[PDB]
């Protein structure tokens, strides 16, 4: 029987004398528009990605892997040492999985196949053969095909049997010192450094188990290996140890038993609350199976020849299962992936029953769950008699996603305390940060957020309290003001002989910069961690934060800082935006910022027009004003500096609206570079009208400009380029080199400085230097030949 | 480039990008233009307590991407975590 | 050679005509390989009942015509009529008519075949009472100068081989745009902006401050005719007709046949008439108003549709000039 199927399937000399344990290789197979045409027409995949179109590259469907992979995957059920009546064979399951990264199969491509036999086990009712094909182009893996076949019969051949399973990832929280001792008991718990402290760490065991057999029940050899990892404070895991269990005769794997009881499983697949119906769809099987057989190369006679079908006791020439796979995945690709081939990312199909030609299949389709922010889509196909025929699932990529993180101003009492009640992941973020604040700075950020306290006194009593006072006394502000840097120590009212410090606000502390900054940055980081927990975060998400967002976004999607390091930085930031401006009277500053709406002044008035008016009013007056937030085009900007120079601008603008001069009509059209004179007139009347008022002057609104209330510092301006050298050397303590994953930034992070997706190239450093003038950056551009190690 | 070196540089840069940010203008037009055109972002998810940056995207679309969004039939979903939980968590009402 | 690939549910028409059961679904029947030549037949048939129920030979019916012409592919049946003489040499004209209509619908299906719509789109268009998208979008009540703005907008953004174009200019304010159903769904969204609800009532508003009211409606076809997408086919069809031995000589055509682009007689051309007629269906647009520029008391519409057909459109274009359209089918 195997001499026949070898003539029909394989194209080699007939030799059954090769080891199953060895690695089977296929021919180098070149994808061509001809074969992708013929294939897609045989399955009914009328998806545009596979059709030749002008000025476009023709993709091949992922189904087409089995076309490439067959010669090799099927060659795994032939060896002498896996004896089987090939007429009685049953293809049980088939699976595709794109390796994360690599793009789908193109029409130019030359695809190398390699199949490996994973697991040959004699069950009571027959022999199961799990095979794994790996498709590689330009010497990189592209996808994995996972077919499982089943020889029906009665086998007692346990010498030629084996099973490599990959166990679920097990997680242990080490709380006590007996937990650590029970683990040191186990010979199979190797550690790279045996002195490593395990206490309060979280361990993950990533374990595969190879297992030869003696009988159905007794393994003649067990092996269970793969790395032990510890969760760091970023939530990144790192290899500390090995599992290295071996054994002869054994009735079980003691490692996986130990970790089932003592640990708990890290299930990647997270179920939705309730399934979401997508479609209930109707496909026919084709009258003949000679079309599919030609294109695939499955010339199994039971599909085409009434004699072989009868000789194998089938109800007739049956439809190839691998046709019903493709047919059904063309409906998944069309409804769930809205006709984008590249979105469907893995696909897995169990062949429950048989289907004859001209049957009519109802396939229900549901969104059931999420897995690393691919959708998880269970289907099931029924014939006319309401019998299940296929089942399976698809992993479908969510549409291209950007996460944007709101900055300050939006803060409210009770913010994200809804999530805190419900979410285990949110709870871990607040609780983690509220313990850090309680112990280093003597307040609870939760209390602040939950009940807006008007006043908040820290006391520095007991030994704990003296430690907490050193933590305020150490907080400086290494300003670069004057030729020589001057260090203005924050909290001047805190010395060896203090017992208290009190934070005053007018309205509530949650509106003060130094409490608002963390309360935002947490609320966000929590929301985000609850999403990540639910499996709702695409691997390839772009992210960006407005001002403070920048931090919450880099904590959330690149785990640069710990939760503890994050709230430090952000609290120091909000503090370093209070010392930054002089406030002689009390907390009033002679600085502020206004929100301009150029639309409202004049339909013509826009960009290149504000960037004159505001640049002149400051070149003229000598009073620092700047545009700081470029938000919406010709609809939202924010200017910030000298409350005087702001009061000129809200007047100068309220003049141009009521005066109703259209700038462009007299910008260049009428008089060219004379306008400086027209403008200098309009300034000097409003300039020296707002240079005689109650020092910290009540800044009034106007048709163009609204004033932002309670904003007393001009941030995102050159004013506090002076207070930077401190903050830059502060970050280099809380942001460590080891905790920066380039992969999680490059292409994905859009800075606020340089609104250009983060890259690490000479080009990008050069563009930063041009908007900064930093020496640590310039010295890198100078000797860019550290490219050589 | 060695990954150990690339890591060193990425750190330096990431630290300088955050240092000066503080003291340099928030360039959030040039940003939205990167994620709405150069990436054709289909979902933009505002993680925040109130929908500010969503309102700003809705308005940056309605201005200079109304034509592009039709001609490419490029249906865009803008979602704020506070207001639109159900469209983010995939929990539609029965 | 590869024709059997295109006719997936075959072309046994005699079988379909006996058993309404064995007749395929409308969508298959509409595909241009089968719909093109079968419309030819429908017209040639209507022409024949007309000749026999008068007791004329097909040449005698032709001699009482002053001129003949057709919209789109109808231009082929027209030039076949113009040749015919007796009941014997009729079947050599009908071979020429349906061979050409076969190679148009075969080589044009190959050049730009219809694929699956994203179901998001299909469901969006059905909740806004637009049709099922297709490669031919019809726009009532908007001048050719108004429409050509809305396509210069839409074709600014799209790349070369996804662009739309005006294809049929049926009336002053009755146009058809041809291209990729995606791209024409792009255009449709751009129009939903500009257009005003049909239930608005602007009888209270000064005339020249009123919103434009206009209907945009997808046709039932399967190819983008008169487009740049079908240009690849043009060369192949000319060569597949020199093989199957199918020229139309100027001498043989005994009445003026009116070209669907200029309105000039096809008998005048220096080159191939067969070639021209392919370009007039594949590439070039259709300027109906200027092809129907002849004068005549009576107009026979043999073509398919009846009251929904070309005839009744031709009636509106020249209502009041003293021209009676008869719907001969």
Swiss-Prot record, chain B:
Cross-link type Glycyl lysine isopeptide (Lys-Gly) (interchain with G-Cter in ubiquitin), residue numbers: 37
Post-translational note: 4'-phosphopantetheine is transferred from CoA to a specific serine of the Acyl carrier domain by the C-terminal PPT domain. This modification is essential for activity because fatty acids are bound in thioester linkage to the sulfhydryl of the prosthetic group.
Disulfide bonds: none
Residues recorded with modification Phosphoserine: 50
UniProt miscellaneous comment: Present with 17000 molecules/cell in log phase SD medium.
Subunit organization: [Alpha(6)beta(6)] hexamers of two multifunctional subunits (alpha and beta).
Role of this protein: Fatty acid synthetase catalyzes the formation of long-chain fatty acids from acetyl-CoA, malonyl-CoA and NADPH. The alpha subunit contains domains for: acyl carrier protein, 3-oxoacyl-[acyl-carrier-protein] reductase, and 3-oxoacyl-[acyl-carrier-protein] synthase. This subunit coordinates the binding of the six beta subunits to the enzyme complex.
Family indicated by similarity: Belongs to the thiolase-like superfamily. Fungal fatty acid synthetase subunit alpha family.
Name by which UniProt lists this protein: Fatty acid synthase subunit alpha
Organism: Saccharomyces cerevisiae (strain ATCC 204508 / S288c)
Taxonomic classification: Eukaryota, Fungi, Dikarya, Ascomycota, Saccharomycotina
Encoding gene, per UniProt annotation: FAS2
Residues included from the entire protein: 1 to 94 of 1887
Swiss-Prot record, chain C:
Catalytic residues identified in the record: 72
Disulphide bond pairs: none
Subunit and interaction comment: [Alpha(6)beta(6)] hexamers of two multifunctional subunits (alpha and beta).
Protein family (similarity comment): Belongs to the fungal fatty acid synthetase subunit beta family.
The protein's role, per its UniProt record: Fatty acid synthetase catalyzes the formation of long-chain fatty acids from acetyl-CoA, malonyl-CoA and NADPH. The beta subunit contains domains for: [acyl-carrier-protein] acetyltransferase and malonyltransferase, S-acyl fatty acid synthase thioesterase, enoyl-[acyl-carrier-protein] reductase, and 3-hydroxypalmitoyl-[acyl-carrier-protein] dehydratase.
Misc remark: Present with 91800 molecules/cell in log phase SD medium.
Name recorded for this polypeptide: Fatty acid synthase subunit beta
